[PDB]
Amino acid sequence: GLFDIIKKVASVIGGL
Amino acid sequence: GLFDIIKKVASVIGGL
Amino acid sequence: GLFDIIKKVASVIGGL
Amino acid sequence: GLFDIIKKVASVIGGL
Amino acid sequence: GLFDIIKKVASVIGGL
Amino acid sequence: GLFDIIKKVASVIGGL
Amino acid sequence: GLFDIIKKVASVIGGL
Amino acid sequence: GLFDIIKKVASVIGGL
Amino acid sequence: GLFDIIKKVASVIGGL
Amino acid sequence: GLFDIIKKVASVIGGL
Amino acid sequence: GLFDIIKKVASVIGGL
Amino acid sequence: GLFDIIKKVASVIGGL
């Protein structure tokens, strides 16, 4: 409605 | 409605 | 709406 | 109504 | 209405 | 109306 | 130490 | 130390 | 140290 | 040691 | 040491 | 050492 704040953090470290 | 805050953290460390 | 702030941080490090 | 003094304040300090 | 004094404030300090 | 004094303030200090 | 997050909201509506 | 995030909101609406 | 993020929002509306 | 294999992951997903 | 394989990841995904 | 395979990653995805 007024604010639609979508914060997505996707941290695939993997590998190593 | 007024604020639709959507915080998603996905942390697939995996690997290792 | 009035503010649609979409902050995506995809951080696939992988490899290594 | 002779004096229809209307005061409205909406302090939508959401987020953070 | 003789005096229809309307004061409206919307302090939508969202985000951050 | 004899005096329709309207004062609307919209301070959408969003973002940051 | 590691994160020192300080959020302060002061909301002196007053007046009115 | 690492992150020193300071978020200050001061909304002195007053007047009105 | 690594990030010193200082976000200040002073919003004195006053008057009206 | 012959094989001093060291793996370290720090995932300081703070903030938000 | 014959093999000193060192893998270090620092994913300091702060802020937002 | 015969094989000092040092791998260092610092992904300081701060701000926003």
Curated annotation (Swiss-Prot), chains A, B, C, D, E, F, G, H, I, J, K, L:
Its main location: secreted. It is found in: Secreted. It comes from the Eukaryota. Keywords: Amidation, Amphibian defense peptide, Antibiotic, Antimicrobial, Secreted. GO terms for biological process: defense response to bacterium. GO terms for cellular component: extracellular region. The modification Leucine amide is found at L16. Signal peptide: none annotated. Expressed by the dorsal and submental skin glands. Bacteriostatic action for Gram-positive bacteria. This is Citropin-1.3. It comes from Ranoidea citropa. The lineage of its organism: Eukaryota, Metazoa, Chordata, Craniata, Vertebrata.
